[PDB]
Amino acid sequence: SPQESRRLSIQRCIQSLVHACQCRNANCSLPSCQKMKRVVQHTKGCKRKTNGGCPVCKQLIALCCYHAKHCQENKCPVPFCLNIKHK
Numbered sequence: 001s002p003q004e005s006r007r008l009s010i011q012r013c014i015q016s017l018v019h020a021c022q023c024r025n026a027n028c029s030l031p032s033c034q035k036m037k038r039v040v041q042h043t044k045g046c047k048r049k050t051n052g053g054c055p056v057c058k059q060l061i062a063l064c065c066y067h068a069k070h071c072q073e074n075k076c077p078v079p080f081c082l083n084i085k086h087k
């Protein structure tokens with residue numbers, strides 16, 4: 001169903017995020033990994049985040065949020081995860 005498809009797509013994106021966060025290898029081939037890294041870097045740099053209402057940052061934060069809901073591991077490399085869980 002549309003919702004399921006979206007949830008799966010989100011989860012697959014999350015797998016890429018999770019991979020990328022752990023993948024301390026700038027030489028990684030994975031376009032998805034490179035993309036996630038770039039998005040993460042962008043977000044960290046873009047202090048404006050959800051204050052300015054930056055779509056990139058908003059998406060990363062939402063992705064991280066959904067990830068956090070799934071991720072009971074309150075010792076996760078993924079940024080925001082921990083903060084969201086505690087919050």
Ligand SMILES: [Zn+2]
Binds near residue numbers: 019023033
């Ligand atoms: Zn990688």
Ligand SMILES: [Zn+2]
Binds near residue numbers: 043
């Ligand atoms: Zn931004």
Ligand SMILES: [Zn+2]
Binds near residue numbers: 067071073077082
């Ligand atoms: Zn996590």
